[PDB]
Amino acid sequence: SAEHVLTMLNEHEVKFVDLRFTDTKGKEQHVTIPAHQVNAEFFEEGKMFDGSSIGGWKGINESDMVLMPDASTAVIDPFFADSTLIIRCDILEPGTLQGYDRDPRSIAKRAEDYLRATGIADTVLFGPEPEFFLFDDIRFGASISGSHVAIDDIEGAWNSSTKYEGGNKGHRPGVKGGYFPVPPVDSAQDIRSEMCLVMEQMGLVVEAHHHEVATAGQNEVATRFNTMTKKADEIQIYKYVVHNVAHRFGKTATFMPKPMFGDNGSGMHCHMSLAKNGTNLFSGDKYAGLSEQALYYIGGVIKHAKAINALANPTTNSYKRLVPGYEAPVMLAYSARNRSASIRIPVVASPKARRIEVRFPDPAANPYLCFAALLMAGLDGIKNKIHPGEPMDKNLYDLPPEEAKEIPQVAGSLEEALNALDLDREFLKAGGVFTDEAIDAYIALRREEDDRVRMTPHPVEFELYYSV
């Protein structure tokens, strides 16, 4: 409670309260309040600001539900003490609820709590596995006359030839080969190790950290599962902390899905399962443990896969990863292997923890929308029948056409994905977790970027198309 927060305020001295607070149709935002100003009223009626990022015609002020005054903590990082204390959207206003043209954290719950009003179960766990890139210099720009971008970080093969002064020292990981190889070679740990400490400090639980697979600083930190609304918001920290230590160390950290080509572009796998009492109705018999229930879920996703990836796969870049691999998970099936397969029902053991890993989502989504939409579907499957059918176990590769061609795809390609969502509306819209707007506005946004991207001619195009 506040009574509490209240102490904490003195527990630590603190002044100011901020970093991470609102968070856009896109991601993260803050405002800073002098230490005083906090006080119940504050806790009970909020504070309010207005529009900007989704909003039309004048003055729609929005209450800032100083909230989840639980989701409150001392941010390491800022200078002088201060309780980073999220806010539950802007609630609305006098009605007091869905922030204008969103309230991502809201939608979260509508979803969440809505779930609860079905009975399909009682609690939904989400355990996302977001990877990120840690490089040294990131320069880029674009303009009438040209366009470009360059990435560098001691590591990333490329750099060997590179001259230094303390000079080369040459231990580094070559293209898809950043594979937990011990140090000299490992840009470093201390950055990860460190990120954990703070991650936990901030309040998440770390499960292991390590180097992913990419020539130039692909790093992954894992974090114990939660409840959509919580976990989603944990991603929000998970991120803030990375960005920051990373930067505090000397690097830039980036959750882009495909910074470079011919390497590995981080992706956010999401593991999930709902439970009733202390029973995860995702379990049972029938295929890899699991159960009827689950299957409708496996159903749900697969059904609106496209609309979802419009939600959990934005900015164009998203899809430069979601390029047909074999490695790359673009198939809409489930397996326990035979990847390529976008739904993995990991082995299990204790039914106690039987789940679903839908990997395709990329570190770029508001865990809020994404999770929501994941769930939202999952259960409309769980809901009206809907049935997986069989798992893959027969990797992609089949007389390419040979209906392997026929085979359902992960909606590779924004515009496309954007579309789906325009049509799928429904299963989202259901419960209230998702207004037409919300949906609209959302689309409407991603739309612009999609444009800026295609109107701007690409370096490669010259490569191939120039001298014609």
Next chain:
Amino acid sequence: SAEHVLTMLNEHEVKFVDLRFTDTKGKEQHVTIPAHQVNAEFFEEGKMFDGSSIGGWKGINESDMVLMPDASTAVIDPFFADSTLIIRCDILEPGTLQGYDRDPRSIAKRAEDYLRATGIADTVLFGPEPEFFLFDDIRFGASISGSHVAIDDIEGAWNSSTKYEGGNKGHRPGVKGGYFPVPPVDSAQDIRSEMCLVMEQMGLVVEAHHHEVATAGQNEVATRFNTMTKKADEIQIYKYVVHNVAHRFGKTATFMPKPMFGDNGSGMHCHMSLAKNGTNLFSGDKYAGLSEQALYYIGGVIKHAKAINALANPTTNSYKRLVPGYEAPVMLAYSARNRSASIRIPVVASPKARRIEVRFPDPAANPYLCFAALLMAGLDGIKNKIHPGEPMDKNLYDLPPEEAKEIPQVAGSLEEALNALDLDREFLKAGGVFTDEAIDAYIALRREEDDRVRMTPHPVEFELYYSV
């Protein structure tokens, strides 16, 4: 009191007494006195210097009413201790009052206290919201042969492509998109956070701080309302502190209204309302809460809007912001939304705090003249009837002409504004708060600049006009 100041002097040791003291037809000034020299006499008869900035023919020495020996405090910043202790203009001389060709702080009060002698009420509150820019390097010059200016600060999009050495690190806010996004991206807080601490240290009350919306370091710090004379003079500190920490941090801070084009040029919104006993006669029923009274005010402004913006909208730059937007508040109406609308009657709640936000004024005015003139009018409306009519609620945009054309404008453009004031004299002149001179001198000044500006040919003109 002095008796007091007197202690404080020993309370702290201190030597010297200065920083911020007089303040021009334009803004801020000081002189330093060895610690001794202070002593009653001093408190009672002042100290005096002379002319320079407004003054004609020899020797008009002016008493320096060592005053508001309340408005006294230890300046952090200067080296060795010293009580920055304003001065109430130069009083005059033997008459002892309106400093030659001004006494901005005086005018303030004439106004203020004059207000009091009407009965329209007892106390006028002003709560300005001044925004400012925080950049790294500011180079410019002009001369027969050429002219120019360049601005830079890690942030401001432009800089991505830019090479560094610790190198890029690329998190920064792109054009109208400095929107409280959390750190990596936020040049930084510590500068704001910090500014608050000192702001309060200096004696103001902070209400929240944050990043405004502009590619390259638009920062805003908010401060609790006051009494014209006090608040006005608080702006005087609000400024000194910004300028200084900002500089002490490594940046230049600038209250110019439109440093760059296609971004956001800070503006000083001013919220106001007068009260009688502990009753703000600005309240009631009839439109958005409010009351008859208020309306005449809404009247007053609107009436002499032009003359006012001549006062609260100088240096040419002022108007490069006051360019017809839709966003930009150049309409002379009131709304509670439908911005574009230069008078916003914010929602309210407790009639306890019902007000008027007239946004158009820019961080560039002597809060003194500005506030004064704001008020001065406000009540001549409040005074002889004068009536708003209806609010907007129908944003600008109407068959441009379609009398939307007809519609009253915020006097966009200095010369113009200058003019108004030449004619409006009156409502200012009334009470004594404003001599012909004052007015004259004032005009007369802004005049020159306006000239230097138009005689000097502009980079763009070459753009477009050169090859003809």
Next chain:
Amino acid sequence: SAEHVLTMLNEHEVKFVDLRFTDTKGKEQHVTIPAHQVNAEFFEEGKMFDGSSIGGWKGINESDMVLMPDASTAVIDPFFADSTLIIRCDILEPGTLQGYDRDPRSIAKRAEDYLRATGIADTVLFGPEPEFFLFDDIRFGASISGSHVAIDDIEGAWNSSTKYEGGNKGHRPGVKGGYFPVPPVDSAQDIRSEMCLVMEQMGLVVEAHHHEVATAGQNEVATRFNTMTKKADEIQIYKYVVHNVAHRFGKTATFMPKPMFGDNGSGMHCHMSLAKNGTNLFSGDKYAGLSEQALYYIGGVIKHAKAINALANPTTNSYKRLVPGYEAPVMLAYSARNRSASIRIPVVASPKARRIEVRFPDPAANPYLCFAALLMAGLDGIKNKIHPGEPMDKNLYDLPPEEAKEIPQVAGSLEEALNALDLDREFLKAGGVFTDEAIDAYIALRREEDDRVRMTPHPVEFELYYSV
């Protein structure tokens, strides 16, 4: 004739036909035709292209009246022979006349020939005196982050200190002091001398050339008077030739009115008078020779001075010259001296050549519109009475106000000028020489620039307004 042109074609071999042809609401344009393609049909039905520069909604092709197939000549400059052969606008189309949203050369004549249908006289002579600047390097640009421009040319004082290698050699003209001083000091002649040769080669008649008064390459070449339509179009060459030799020599030539500040920005004085048979009804008795007739003219201008300078004084820069001088001709009176006075009735001798010099117009106008509008007015004065009153002979300077203040001004300042024209319509509109459109479109254009100019903040503004 064509029959002719026809020879000329063989007289010289030539292939191609082009340089200078159409010419915008602004100034000059061409298209190149293979030598063949010319042939009567061509001469009789033209060639046609379409829109771009003034044009709305699709496809309005415009005939190109291969015309004034008189106004035809071998362009020195282009590579391979070619008959630069103007075109009489695009005529229209099937109607065949006023080019879409103009036909500047057309308007010219409507005017001209319209004149003829009044009887006020038979022929109007125009003898403009356009000055231009000849510099070495011209760099400038503007953009979110900054703006600027730099000018240089051995000459322009500034350069003395400048180091060279063949090194300094120091003879050059210091600020308002480029005054026919003999060579070492005179950037050079050969550029002028040369320009003459070609000017005549192109077909104009040179009367004398020399250095005007400005530190850095102000050059003037004079050319014998003509008929609006002819002379106007002569300016069109006068220009092309300058631009070109100038460039061919090693310099950039610029007809901007005020490239630099505190120097002299070229201006196009225009001398005029109409005649009946071989009698210039501008003569007589009554003031400085002259005659009733003239006076109504002197009237006409003075009457719509503002609207005219909107026509013969564009791009903003225009007015940085038309800044109140005493030297500077912004007064609306006539004198034979007492300059400051925008209308000079030069001494005379032979009534044979008695005229009117209205100096204010600047090298920047389509001689077409300008001349037209000059005339167009001139005679609406000549027309319905309208009367000068007395000449100045009492330079500006009179208790500034002392109604010297009262005194009619040269409409200094675009927006303003723009306006006038919006209202003055009439006297233009009269005859058909000027459609509402034409007028509209015109305005509408200058409008944009005027904007780009004021929205973009100015180097100086930082000078003065920054540290506030």
